[PDB]
Design an enzyme around this catalytic site. Structure first.
Site, short mmCIF file in Angstrom:
data_model
loop_
_atom_site.label_atom_id
_atom_site.label_comp_id
_atom_site.label_asym_id
_atom_site.label_seq_id
_atom_site.Cartn_x
_atom_site.Cartn_y
_atom_site.Cartn_z
CG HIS A 45 2.65 134.82 19.57
ND1 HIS A 45 1.95 134.24 18.68
CD2 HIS A 45 2.38 133.53 21.01
CE1 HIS A 45 1.44 132.91 19.23
NE2 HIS A 45 2.08 132.62 20.41
CG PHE A 49 6.41 129.83 7.95
CD1 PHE A 49 6.02 130.38 9.45
CD2 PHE A 49 5.05 129.49 7.49
CE1 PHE A 49 4.81 130.13 9.78
CE2 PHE A 49 4.55 129.04 7.86
CZ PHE A 49 3.82 129.74 8.91
NE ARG A 94 -6.52 137.43 17.83
CZ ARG A 94 -7.49 136.46 16.57
NH1 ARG A 94 -8.35 136.74 17.09
NH2 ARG A 94 -7.02 137.24 15.08
NE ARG A 134 1.70 140.61 15.71
CZ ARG A 134 0.46 139.75 15.83
NH1 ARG A 134 -0.54 140.17 15.78
NH2 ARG A 134 0.93 139.38 16.27
CB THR A 174 -0.07 138.50 10.95
OG1 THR A 174 -1.55 138.05 12.10
CG2 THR A 174 0.48 137.82 11.94
CE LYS A 194 6.68 136.13 18.27
NZ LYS A 194 5.70 136.10 16.64
CE1 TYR A 226 5.22 130.67 18.07
CE2 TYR A 226 6.60 129.71 18.50
CZ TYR A 226 6.02 130.61 17.69
OH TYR A 226 6.09 132.12 18.76
CD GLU A 232 -0.24 130.50 22.94
OE1 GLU A 232 -1.09 132.09 23.93
OE2 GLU A 232 -0.67 130.96 22.12
CG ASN A 287 5.07 139.72 14.43
OD1 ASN A 287 5.67 138.93 15.51
ND2 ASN A 287 3.99 138.77 14.30
#
Lengths: 191, 283, 158, 252
Positions: C118, C57, C85, C105, C91, C9, C49, C129, C115
């Site tokens: 993803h 949010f 993960r 993270r 998260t 990100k 998303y 995805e 973070n």
């Protein structure tokens, strides 16, 4: 049990035997250093903890006033464990140091980024004192005084190695009897 | 706007002399350094009288190029100002003034620079400042000991208390410049124009300055000469023909037997002979 | 073999740490099938998303996921979905920093939305995805070759 | 992919690190290295380093070899060393026994610069006289077994089980990380890199725009290595008196 205050400003809170310190006692010196430990015949004798003006704790086992034998000394990212002769270090020792200056700068290897072990080292070493000195009085060269330490030598000729990460203050010293003592770790750095 | 005037030394000739002696930073970096000192000396917003190149300090994550300027408290060891950069041509940064406290406190430790000025220095032997102050203390200590000049080039002007560059000075042969009786100090010792021959000898009646020559044969007719410092490895002085220069390149670490500081002394108590319980007579 | 979809990100990209993140990804036995550095628009970041159109949010996130360039990655390993993960960790950056001090993270995140990573969560979502970002990589023609569903897909195509 | 380090590129890239040679010595090397390489029958011969002396006649040291082979899990290079004090005439730098290796390891200070000198040591009082060239060889051996840096996966094993250049080497993926480099004596594919060394004994500065990484040894200050990634070249050099830095724990 007794509490005493001396004309220089030094205080004592602890136990007396026949007009002198004996047993457990905490002494606060005019400089701000605190010795919490064991006394005999009015001087440090046995195991005690000495926080000094430099905000570092010195442990060990004093004998007739002077730290003699195996003694450790601590600071935020430092630890010195070694022999002491008449308060002066002399003989085998081990220096354990952590690199605090570069804890937030990026690492050189991607192995260290995620490794659960810190950047601590450990070096075997030795201190050295003139031969004639170190004896007990009852000529010979004099001991290394404070400002110059004239005659004190230091030898290290092996490699260092990894070591477990240090923390400050050491729990062998708590509760801390002075103020303005920082706190060091590796997940937090110097505070 | 008109560029301000400034004095300096022949820097391309300095690169040439250093390269002939085998020290320094080469001759491509010599060109880059000369152009950087030009960009510094010809700056209106920075009214500089003189620029000089002190040397280079090697760090862990970056390095320090160091220029010494004069600016048209202001005496002793703060006579000059020092600007450092990470890369030649990048933005400069003025180092603070040096205080005797931090000089004395850095004289007790031995550290590698991290290449970042806003970094801590020591924990146990407490250094009062951050890395910038340690660098300034190093610069002061090295300037006091290594920055030199050929003998009889300068003289001590009594009234003004300064140095007079005589213009009848003749250099000796290059291979005769490699003696320690042919250079003198031009910085206060932290008297002034004392020959390098009268320095503190190293253990074993060893002179503190060692010769360097430009050629292996004593029969080449135009060769350079110089000295290298034993106490501060990386500090070199050298002259060829009529040109000469001093510089420092290195890590900043001294060359002396290092003894880490013992734990500080422990305080004594009050004398019992003067604090003792009295008593009245017995039956 | 399992293929998962990852993401670096803009906060990690701006800090100059995408190369370190990829090098750690590969130090942990993964194999980057594909990498790309693109800039996501507004409507496409929405549709990515798109299952959170009613979430509060959502604008706070979508305005962050366009704040700069991102790194889209396709990772592969035996049991890749859950290992990735376990690498990204919790998260909540502070929760992670409390529990796993050496997590991803916990080293490159700052906020509950910053973070720096993803991953996917389910193989269905991972496939979706990847087909969204890399529509060229063919994903399991074996499974989709149903002798009956093919006639229905022909009816769809006609 | 280079086949052998080029002294011109080495001296060009490592000049900022103060690793320089005199001009006369540079020309003399340009002539002398091929002569000695041919008349010794060696496939490779390069300038290893330069050790400073007290009388100004620094020792230039060159290292050569013919072929490297995998033995007992190590990539062994049968190296041969030569020394010089002018850059024109190379003499042999003969190996030293193991017993004398300890004694020369005990001798410290900057070398004298007189190949005929010999130092003295005292033991239980039996005195030994150690020639200066022995001390020089021992210091070179220590520095060599400590650093000897090459990029990772730049070598490869061939059918005869010999270590040869990997001519399909594409370059280090992350040149600013210590994982990209390794010791020469580590077998290809063994996964042992410089990151397995004692943490804190190496520094890496990477200019990501020009693509030049510099790896400096902090344990032996004076050993510099460079790696240029856009042209795929690399090479190292030692310049200094040859003594190890034992105070490293206090300096980091």
């Amino acid at each position: 049990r007794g509490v005493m205050v001396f004309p220089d400003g030094g205080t004592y809170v602890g136990e007396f035997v026949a007009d002198k310190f004996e047993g457990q006692g905490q002494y606060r010196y005019p400089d701000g250093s605190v010795y919490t430990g064991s006394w005999a015949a009015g001087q440090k004798h046995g195991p005690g903890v000495y926080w000094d003006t430099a905000r570092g704790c010195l442990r060990g086992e004093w004998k007739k006033g002077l730290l003699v034998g195996k003694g450790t000394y601590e600071q935020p990212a430092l630890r010195f464990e070694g022999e002491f002769v008449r308060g002066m270090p002399a003989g085998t020792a081990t220096y354990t140091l952590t690199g605090h200056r570069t804890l937030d700068m990026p690492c050189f290897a991607a192995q260290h980024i995620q490794a659960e072990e810190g950047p601590t080292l450990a070096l075997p070493c030795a201190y050295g004192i003139p031969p004639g000195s170190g004896d007990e009085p009852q000529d010979k060269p004099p001991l290394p005084a404070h400002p110059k330490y004239e005659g004190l030598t230091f030898t290290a000729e092996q490699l260092p190695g990894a070591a477990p990460d240090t923390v400050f203050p050491p729990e062998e010293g708590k509760p801390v009897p002075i103020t303005a003592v920082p706190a060091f770790s590796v997940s937090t750095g110097l505070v | 706007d008109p560029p301000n005037e400034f004095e300096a030394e022949n820097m391309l000739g300095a690169a040439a002399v250093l390269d002939c002696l085998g020290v320094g930073l080469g001759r491509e970096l010599g060109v880059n350094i000369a152009l950087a000192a030009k960009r510094i000396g010809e700056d209106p917003k920075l009214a500089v009288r003189s620029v000089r190149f002190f040397g280079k300090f090697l760090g862990l994550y970056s390095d320090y190029f160091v220029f010494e300027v004069a600016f048209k408290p202001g005496k002793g060891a703060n006579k000059f100002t020092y600007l450092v950069c990470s890369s030649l041509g990048g933005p400069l940064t003025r180092l603070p003034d040096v205080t005797p406290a931090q000089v004395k406190a850095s004289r007790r430790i031995k550290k590698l620079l991290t290449g970042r000025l806003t970094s801590h220095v020591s924990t146990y032997p407490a250094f009062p400042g951050n890395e910038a102050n340690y660098l300034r203390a190093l610069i002061a200590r090295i300037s006091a000991a290594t920055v030199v000049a050929p003998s009889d080039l300068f003289s001590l002007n009594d009234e003004t208390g300064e140095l007079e560059r005589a213009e009848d000075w003749e250099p000796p042969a290059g291979r005769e410049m490699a003696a320690p009786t042919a250079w003198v100090h031009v910085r206060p010792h932290l008297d002034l124009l004392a020959a390098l021959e009268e320095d503190a000898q190293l253990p074993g009646e060893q002179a503190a300055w060692t010769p360097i020559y430009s050629s292996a044969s004593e029969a080449v007719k135009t060769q350079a000469g110089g000295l290298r410092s034993l106490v501060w490895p990386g500090a070199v002085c050298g002259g060829r023909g009529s040109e000469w220069t001093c510089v420092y390149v290195g890590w900043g670490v001294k060359n002396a037997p290092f003894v880490p500081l013992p734990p500080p002394p422990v305080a004594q108590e009050f004398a019992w002979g003067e604090v003792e319980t009295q008593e009245l007579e017995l039956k | 073999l399992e293929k998962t979809f990852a993401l670096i990100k803009p906060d990690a990209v701006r800090a100059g740490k995408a190369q370190e993140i990829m090098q750690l990804i590969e130090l942990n036995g993964f194999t980057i099938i594909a990498k790309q550095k693109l800039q996501l628009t507004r409507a496409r970041a929405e549709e990515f998303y798109g299952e959170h159109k009613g979430k509060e949010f959502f604008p706070k996130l979508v305005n962050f996921m366009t704040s700069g360039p991102i790194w889209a990655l396709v990772l592969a390993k035996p049991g890749a979905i859950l290992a990735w993960r376990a690498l990204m960790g919790p998260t909540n950056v502070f929760k992670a920093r409390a529990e796993q001090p050496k997590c991803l993270r916990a080293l490159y995140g700052t906020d509950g939305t910053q973070n720096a990573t993803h991953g996917s969560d389910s193989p269905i979502s991972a496939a979706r995805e990847i087909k969204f970002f890399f529509p060229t990589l063919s994903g399991d023609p074996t499974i989709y070759a149903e002798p009956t569903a093919a006639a229905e897909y022909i009816t769809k195509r006609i | 992919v280079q086949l052998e380090p080029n002294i011109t590129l080495v001296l060009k890239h490592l000049a900022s690190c103060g690793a320089v040679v005199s001009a006369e010595q540079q020309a003399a090397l340009d002539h002398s290295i091929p002569i000695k390489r041919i008349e010794a029958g060696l496939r490779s011969l390069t300038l290893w380093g330069r050790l400073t002396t007290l009388n100004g006649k620094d020792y230039l040291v060159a290292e050569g070899y013919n072929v490297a082979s995998s033995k007992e899990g190590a990539a062994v290079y049968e190296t041969k060393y030569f020394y010089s004090q002018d850059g024109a005439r190379w003499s042999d730098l003969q190996p030293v026994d193991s017993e004398t290796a300890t004694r020369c390891a005990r001798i410290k200070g900057m070398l004298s610069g007189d190949p005929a000198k010999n130092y003295e040591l005292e033991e239980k009082p039996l005195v030994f006289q150690i020639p200066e060239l022995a001390v020089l060889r021992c210091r070179v051996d220590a520095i060599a077994t400590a650093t000897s840096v090459i990029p990772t996966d730049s070598t490869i094993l061939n059918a005869a089980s010999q270590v040869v250049p990997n001519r399909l080497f594409a370059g280090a993926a992350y040149p600013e990380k210590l994982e990209s480099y390794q010791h020469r004596f580590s077998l290809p594919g063994s996964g042992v890199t410089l990151s397995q060394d004692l943490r804190g004994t190496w520094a890496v500065q990477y200019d990501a725009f020009k693509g030049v990484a510099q790896v400096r040894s902090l344990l032996f200050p004076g050993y510099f290595f460079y790696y240029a990634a856009n042209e795929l070249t690399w090479g190292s050099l030692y310049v200094g008196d040859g003594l190890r830095n034992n105070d490293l724990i206090f300096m980091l």
